[PDB]
Ligand binder design. Structure first.
Ligand code: WSB
Ligand code: WSB
Ligand code: MG
Ligand code: MG
Ligand code: MG
Ligand code: MG
Ligand code: ZN
Ligand code: ZN
Lengths: 926, 73, 186, 98, 186
RNA sequence: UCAUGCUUCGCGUGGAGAAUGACGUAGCAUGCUAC
RNA sequence: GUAGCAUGCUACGUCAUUCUCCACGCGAAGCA
């Protein structure tokens, strides 16, 4: 065995420690991207049969250089030798030795690869994509080995969290240039293969973390000059790591080296199409599918997503000041304006308006509305701003003074509190205690909640998997009907809301909805189909009761965007809200037996059912732009008859320009929104539901493809996995048969109930145990590598007993009670929530009970199901509310008789302090 | 029931401060908000009773605003 | 809805119907009386419905006026009511520190800054008269908010420093009150 | 272990010619994806050096491409890819041997 | 209305009934008079219903007319406000620098984000803490966006003038942060 | 400053159907008068 | 047998209240 160790070294003049035993082998768990006629997927297999000898430095200091010797069969040894003699000249190819060593009496052929790292790139991608907080040794070793951090950095806890420990982004970004050099070396390898006429599939597991390629088992030889390096799974799997590690940060420096200063781009330059094509040619030369830098030229939704992925990657290399509205000077009646005539989206490239009017004569009401909404004139006239309180880009300060907006403490209803305490409440050691309050905020509240939009990062998706997931997710919206509607058919719920900035200076939404006729609204909607209208979304500060001290803000979008998005999603979404028994349970009440029906629909014939749930930590402020664009695209799938592709693209451009990356007016100053979603647009809850379903389907895909494949003892599921790999990384066009089959499989074994960012899942526990459907960890991994968010155990729950119902859904607990020879599920709230609603109120008038008796009737309706709870105090909550309602009615009658001496007690009010009126609200007869 | 009485009293005390125009001093208002929020989500009565003393000292500093003699009759 | 001019008439008609059925008179007269009773009942029903509608409107107006009257009384006495509630609750709490500082403020020994909570921090407090000084200040220790504070400076009314030995009822009239006492928590 | 075509790509006989005139007679072998909806031919293998168009059963005419300088190992029999073919399909045509 | 067009028949019916009650010519003539009264009453009720319906329609039409007129008044009042706002900001543009940058553009189209950064004549910097002040706006003249800005006025969160000599690490806790410094391009 | 949607409670106004009660014009059963 | 009157049923026209469905207005509550 010592003679062997002296021929593995050969003549390279190294020195080897037999890390792997010389003539014996080495066995470990390593991630592979495998696809045979038997097995498929991207899973951690058990590598074996290799001997890995480590190398010592001049000083006796071990380095991460390993000689990997392998035993091969003569027939594959000859083939690999003759396929390596052709690629031997490429710099991005690890050396090989190809010797024959005698074992027993047979000259066994050995292949020795020289100076490979410990881990390959497949290990890095797998570790960063299937991330388990309790199992990270293979990632910690990678990070420490390449001086990304120190071994003591992991003593800190939450070190992996993107929110609790935002410094982890720097640690990951220390891997950027290694990944970039790997990309350059794979491009070199592809060029060598093409020039030598070698045909083969490039996989991540054949490239170590220095970029070298070393395995030629399944390559074949053709005529020189015509080789076909098949890099689809390679790049598609590698894509998320490229933005997680910020691999292209070296492209922001002169000469593309990190030591020289940044590039000082021309300030007036906005069209980076040439640079985008240069980057694509430099790093993705052999990516077959065509790339459109400007998504105006894309062919359909599946081509918009594909090109916007690359635009997301490449827009991190360009100055932040070049993205946004493209302004131009136009003369109206001889007066020069400055109006937006285009846009530069970080994902969609450059878009130019088609109806730009130069040298006009007059501005109609529609034209004034359009020009008074875009930030062109507002920002071009305000003074410069440098806001050091936030990392978000600051555009301008419209006024001469900054506005600081506070939040008030809240009002105390002392009569209710005294009554409750007289009824034996709020004593020491009581299961029910006040936990919901009105919290106050100092001057820096809205600007402090914007620093939470700071959590949105450029995320590049695995585009092939994203396309398949989109095709599958679109089947959850097949029972609905949608399209464009006229202004006559738009239903506005409340017309007494604000119209946004600057339209809130002159009136509410009613003023504008009754000022401009239906013809003007139709004209504006048609205008938005071939032009982009940027708008400003105000940042409003909420005033509500909550259990934690966070200054929650919402987005007051303008009125133009609201009108033009209603004329699309009003008809798209009324059907979603009017449908019963679907996965999305928006529009379904919890009264009159609705909750029971929803749960029984969720439990729909699942075999070994367990319940799971979750809630995204920062849903709106951490949602990647790719998935928001996807949510907008699948909602527009209903416009196949009323809109052409150009109209659909311009509607997407409008949505992105006013609810994805708009300009927000926070305290009299304009800021640029990094991304995420604006909670307060026409499609908040429905877009959130689409995003939730997409994340769930992605989790299931990853769970099914990361399974071994040889261990699955069910033939149908094994074939399903084998074809799921094909339909992602070997099919360019959607296969409807398998999309239907996978949708049916998910519905059978993974039954969802979605309401915005809230979700409940009934899943086959046996399959989830065997790895054949998504567990609660396959969902945390997806959030980590595709949402830049770590989801902790405080946000997810599981239930092995489904006679208890979900632990929480929409802040409602479930209880299996009896009402009339039937066991039904009833929702009850947190008693502290109801008691806090009773004790603390918004206005000072609400602290007078006799004026607000319906206010307590609603709370009693909400709190009735607590009467069935085994805990006595919970029932005492409802009884307290009933007795207080009776007391308020008595006081009101007394006041009326004393002041206005006429009695109006009547008899219809008596039903309010009785339990029947509230019993009838949870019985299935309406 | 002395733990839910200091939270309600803190809410009322910050309400009284707000309508006394303490919101026009950003530093003092920030201190008052910190004390109020800390009292609301406190778990030990002794800590809440020190933060309450601090907040009531803030209120009592403004001698001209309120007349303690009449209110504490 | 009795006492109406219709109801009473109808009632009499009903009595007229009670006699005829007992009288067993001619069919024509019986049907005439039935028709009269029906028309009287219809008239009474009309009048009763109109009266009930008017009463409903009157009650609605009365309740709206009551709501309007009480909303203004809630919004106009917010300042006084809130302060009275605050001090009622503080009286109910019955804490030694809160009560001590409230009583001191009642006597005029108000603070100048926020009472510190740290292990050691500065506190400046007014001392209007020697009586409060002897009640609280003894030697170098000062009792406030149920805690002991080490006196570290006693500024005179003229911003002039005062030695702790200058303060006494024998010499108190000479000095210029109020005295600002600066102390550190112990 | 990631392979180009684990299962040999299916093939059948078809007709093709320089123009749309010589498609009457079948003289070429074509590889087609087995279950891509119907039939989708990826390449044409023939002992000819002038083919530019191919026709298949309604009748559909598919644009061919010039062949790389190829002496395919079973003569000058070329291998014509369909225009617009992607890398994976190009590999399978050669991975399924030619 | 009491004096409806077809009230003559009803008046004649009532008068004839009164005369018959006073006189009572006979039973058959009484029945004929009852029939005439009934037909006149039916016609009168038909006319009254028609008139009430027409009155309701006219009232609704006039209410709609007034609502539309008020809506047009509000539209004409908001159009002037929007025009005034647009023409006010327009006169606020610094035309020399704006024209200079626009002309240098290849196609007269430039990103919005550079219009303030390269043309704004006033800068506002919001400084949370003292380290930020030392880093960015130290001194009476600083550099930003490749331009030299001369500090003009520093105010605190309360919008009160703060002298540049009061911004020091020792006085940092005594200031109402954040400080807003307005500077003028040099 | 206070967004987008969903659900429910109370009150008020308008419209359309069904049940009971009242009055003219027509169809059916019996009785009375003219013949 | 025809016509008129009386009693009892069915078909057209107008009002009296009584419950349903919708259309909007006002106030209120929960939820994402
Ligand atoms: O039919 C197969 C082939 C492979 N495997 C699993 O897949 C792993 C990797 O198989 P492999 O061909 O990639 C090794 P090799 O090509 O020499 O080296 P590199 O990958 O480092 O280039 C094996 O351990 C085994 O668990 C399987 O189940 N069935
Ligand atoms: O009034 C609301 C509340 C919520 N939302 C939408 O519903 C999402 C989730 O709402 P949520 O209660 O779960 C708080 P979330 O943002 O998750 O933060 P935390 O988990 O840290 O509390 C938001 O993003 C937003 O799009 C809305 O439109 N309006
Ligand atoms: Mg090998
Ligand atoms: Mg959430
Ligand atoms: Mg939630
Ligand atoms: Mg492999
Ligand atoms: Zn494209
Ligand atoms: Zn459409």
């Amino acid at each position: 065995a010592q003679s062997f160790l002296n021929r593995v070294c050969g003549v390279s003049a190294a020195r080897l420690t037999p890390c792997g035993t010389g003539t014996s082998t080495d066995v470990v768990y390593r991630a592979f991207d495998i696809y045979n006629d038997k097995v498929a997927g991207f899973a951690k297999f058990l590598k074996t049969n290799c001997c890995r000898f480590q190398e010592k430095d001049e000083d006796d200091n071990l380095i991460d250089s390993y000689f990997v010797v392998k035993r091969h069969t003569f027939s594959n040894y000859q083939h690999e030798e003759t396929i390596y003699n052709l690629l031997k000249d490429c710099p991005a190819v690890a050396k090989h030795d190809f010797f024959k060593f005698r074992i027993d009496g047979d000259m066994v052929p050995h292949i020795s690869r020289q100076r490979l790292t410990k881990y390959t790139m497949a290990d890095l991608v797998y570790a960063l994509r299937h991330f388990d907080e309790g199992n990270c040794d293979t990632l910690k070793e990678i990070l420490v080995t390449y001086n990304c951090c120190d071994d003591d950095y992991f003593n800190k806890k939450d070190w992996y969290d993107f929110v609790e420990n935002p410094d982890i982004l720097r640690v990951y970004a220390n891997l950027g240039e290694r990944v970039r050099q790997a990309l350059l070396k794979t491009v070199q390898f592809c060029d060598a293969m093409r020039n030598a006429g070698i045909v083969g599939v490039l996989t991540l597991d054949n490239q170590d973390l220095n970029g070298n390629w070393y395995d030629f088992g399944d390559f074949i030889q053709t005529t020189p000059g015509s080789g076909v390096p098949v890099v689809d799974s390679y790049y598609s799997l590698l894509m998320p790591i490229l933005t997680l590690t910020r691999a292209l940060t070296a492209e922001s420096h002169v000469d593309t080296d990190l030591t020289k200063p940044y590039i000082k781009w021309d300030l007036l330059k906005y069209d980076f199409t040439e640079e985008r094509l240069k980057l694509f040619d430099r790093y993705f030369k052999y990516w077959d599918q065509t790339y459109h830098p400007n998504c105006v030229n894309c062919l359909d939704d599946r081509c918009i997503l594909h090109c916007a992925n690359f635009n997301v990657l490449f827009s991190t290399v360009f100055p932040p000041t070049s993205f946004g509205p493209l302004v131009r000077k136009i003369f109206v009646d001889g007066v020069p304006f400055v109006v937006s005539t285009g846009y530069h989206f970080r994902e969609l490239g450059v878009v130019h308006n088609q109806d730009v009017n130069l040298h006009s004569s007059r501005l109609s009401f529609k034209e004034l509305l359009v020009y008074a909404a875009d930030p062109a004139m507002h920002a071009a006239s305000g003074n410069l701003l440098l806001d050091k309180r936030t990392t978000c880009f600051s555009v301008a300060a419209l006024t001469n003074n900054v506005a600081f907006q506070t939040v008030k403490p809240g009002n105390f209803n002392k009569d209710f509190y005294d009554f409750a305490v007289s009824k034996g409440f709020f004593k020491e050691g009581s299961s029910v205690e006040l936990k919901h309050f009105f919290f106050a905020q100092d001057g820096n509240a809205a600007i402090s909640d914007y620093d939470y939009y700071r959590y949105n990062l450029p995320t590049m998706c695995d585009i092939r998997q994203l396309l398949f997931v989109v095709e599958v997710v679109d089947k959850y919206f097949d029972c609905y009907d949608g399209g464009c509607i006229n202004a006559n058919q738009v239903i506005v719920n409340n017309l007494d809301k604000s119209a946004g900035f600057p339209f809130n200076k002159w009136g509410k939404a009613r003023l504008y909805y009754d000022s401009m006729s239906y013809e003007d609204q139709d004209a504006l909607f048609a205008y938005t189909k071939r032009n982009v209208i940027p708008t400003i979304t105000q940042m409003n500060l909420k005033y509500a009761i909550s259990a934690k001290n966070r200054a929650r803000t919402v987005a007051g979008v303008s009125i133009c965007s609201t009108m033009t998005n209603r004329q699309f999603h009003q008809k798209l979404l009324k059907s979603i809200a009017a449908t019963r028994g679907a996965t999305v349970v928006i529009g379904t009440s919890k009264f009159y037996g609705g909750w029971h029906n929803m749960l029984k629909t969720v439990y729909s014939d699942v075999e070994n059912p367990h319940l799971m749930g979750w809630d995204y930590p920062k849903c709106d402020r951490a949602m990647p732009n790719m998935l928001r664009i996807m949510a907008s695209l699948v909602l527009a799938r209903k416009h196949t008859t009323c809109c052409s592709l150009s109209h659909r693209f311009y509607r997407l451009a409008n949505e992105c320009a006013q609810v994805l990356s708009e300009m927000v007016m926070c305290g009299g100053s304009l800021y640029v929104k990094p991304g995420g979603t604006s909670s307060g647009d026409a499609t908040t809850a429905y877009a959130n539901s689409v995003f939730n379903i997409c994340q769930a389907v992605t989790a299931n895909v990853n769970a099914l493809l990361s399974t071994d494949g040889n261990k699955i003892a069910d033939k149908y599921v094994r074939n399903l996995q084998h074809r799921l790999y094909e339909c992602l990384y070997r099919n360019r066009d959607v296969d409807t048969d398998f999309v239907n089959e996978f949708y049916a499989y998910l519905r059978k074994h993974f039954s969802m109930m979605i309401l915005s960012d809230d979700a409940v899942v009934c899943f086959n526990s046996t399959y989830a145990s065997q790895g054949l459907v998504a567990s609660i960890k396959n969902f945390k991994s997806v959030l980590y590598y595709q949402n830049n968010v770590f989801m902790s155990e405080a946000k997810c729950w599981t239930e092995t007993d489904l006679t208890k119902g979900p632990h929480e859904f929409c802040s409602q607990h479930t209880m299996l009670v009896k009402q009339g020879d039937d066991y039904v599920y009833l929702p009850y709230p947190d008693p502290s929530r109801i008691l806090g609603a009773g004790c603390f109120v918004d206005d000072i008038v609400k602290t007078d009970g006799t004026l607000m008796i319906e206010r307590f009737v609603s709370l009693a309706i909400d709190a009735y199901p607590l009467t069935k709870h085994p805990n006595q105090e919970y029932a005492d909550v409802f009884h307290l509310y009933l007795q207080y309602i009776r007391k308020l009615h008595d006081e009101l009658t007394g006041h009326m008789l004393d002041m206005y001496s006429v009695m109006l007690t009547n008899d219809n009010t008596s039903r309010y302090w009785e339990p029947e009126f509230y019993e009838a609200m949870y019985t299935p007869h309406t | 029931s002395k733990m839910s009485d200091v939270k309600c009293t803190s809410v009322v005390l910050l309400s009284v401060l707000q309508q006394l125009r303490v919101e026009s001093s950003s530093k003092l208002w920030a201190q008052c908000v910190q004390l109020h929020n800390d009292i609301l989500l406190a778990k030990d009565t002794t800590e809440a009773f020190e933060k309450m003393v601090s907040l009531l000292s803030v209120l009592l500093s403004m001698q001209g605003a309120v007349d303690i003699n009449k209110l504490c009759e | 809805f009795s006492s109406l001019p219709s109801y009473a008439a109808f009632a009499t008609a009903q009595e007229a119907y009670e006699q005829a059925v007992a009288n067993g008179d001619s069919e024509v007269v019986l049907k005439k009386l039935k028709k009269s009773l029906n028309v009287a009942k219809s008239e009474f029903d009309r009048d009763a419905a109109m009266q009930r509608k008017l009463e409903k409107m009157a009650d609605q107006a009365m309740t709206q006026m009551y709501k309007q009257a009480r909303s203004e009384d809630k919004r106009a006495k917010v300042t006084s009511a809130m302060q009275t509630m605050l001090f009622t609750m503080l009286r109910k709490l019955d804490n030694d520190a809160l009560n001590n500082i409230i009583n001191n403020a009642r006597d005029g020994c108000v603070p100048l800054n926020i009472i510190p909570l740290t292990t050691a921090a500065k506190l400046m407090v007014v001392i209007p008269d020697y009586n409060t000084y002897k009640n609280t200040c003894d030697g170098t220790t000062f009792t406030y908010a149920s805690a002991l504070w080490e006196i570290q400076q006693v500024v005179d009314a003229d911003s002039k420093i005062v030695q702790l030995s200058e303060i006494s009822m024998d010499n108190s009239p000479n000095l210029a009150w109020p005295l600002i006492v600066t102390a550190l928590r112990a | 272990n990631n392979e180009l075509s684990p299962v040999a790509l299916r093939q059948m006989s078809c007709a093709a010619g320089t123009t749309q005139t010589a498609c009457t007679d079948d003289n070429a072998l074509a590889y087609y994806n087995t279950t891509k909806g119907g039939r989708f031919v990826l390449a044409l293998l023939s002992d000819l050096q002038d083919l530019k168009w191919a026709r298949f059963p309604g009748t559909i005419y598919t644009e061919l491409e010039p062949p790389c300088r190829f002496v395919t190992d079973t003569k000058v029999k070329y291998l014509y890819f369909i225009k617009g073919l992607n890398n994976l399909n190009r590999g399978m045509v050669l991975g399924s041997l030619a």
